[PDB]
Design a protein around this ligand. Structure first.
Ligand SMILES: CCCCCC/C=C\CCCCCCCCCC(=O)O
Length: 97
């Protein structure tokens, strides 16, 4: 699963984020995000509680093979962008790694 795979990164991503896939029927809607033990990324121009992650570096997280590709690619990246849906609207947030 994607969460179990994010745990391999030297950045302690799961210290900053609590993540659950969101299912509807046979569809994955995205990944629901909330603060980890360190809530630093949650701020006005950053993430919000209950944001829905739908893309990583422009790759659709809802599509299983694409998401796999996006995750293998995060390994040697220096800055990554997350697209979230928040009360109907998309927002892009970048993170320095
Ligand atoms: C659903 C897929 C979610 C993947 C999201 C990854 C998002 C953010 C990574 C945040 C890393 C934050 C700390 C990076 C290491 C150094 C930064 C610091 O000084 O804390």
């Amino acid at each position: 699963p994607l969460v179990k795979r994010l745990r391999e990164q030297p950045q302690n991503i799961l210290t900053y984020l609590s993540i659950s896939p969101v299912l509807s029927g046979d569809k994955l809607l995205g990944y629901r995000l909330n603060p980890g033990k360190d809530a630093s990324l949650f701020r006005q121009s950053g993430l919000q509680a209950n944001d829905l992650a739908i893309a990583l570096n422009g790759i659709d997280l809802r599509d299983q093979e694409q998401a796999q590709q996006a995750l293998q690619n995060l390994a040697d990246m220096t800055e990554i962008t997350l697209t979230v849906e928040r009360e109907g609207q998309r927002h892009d947030i970048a993170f320095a790694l």
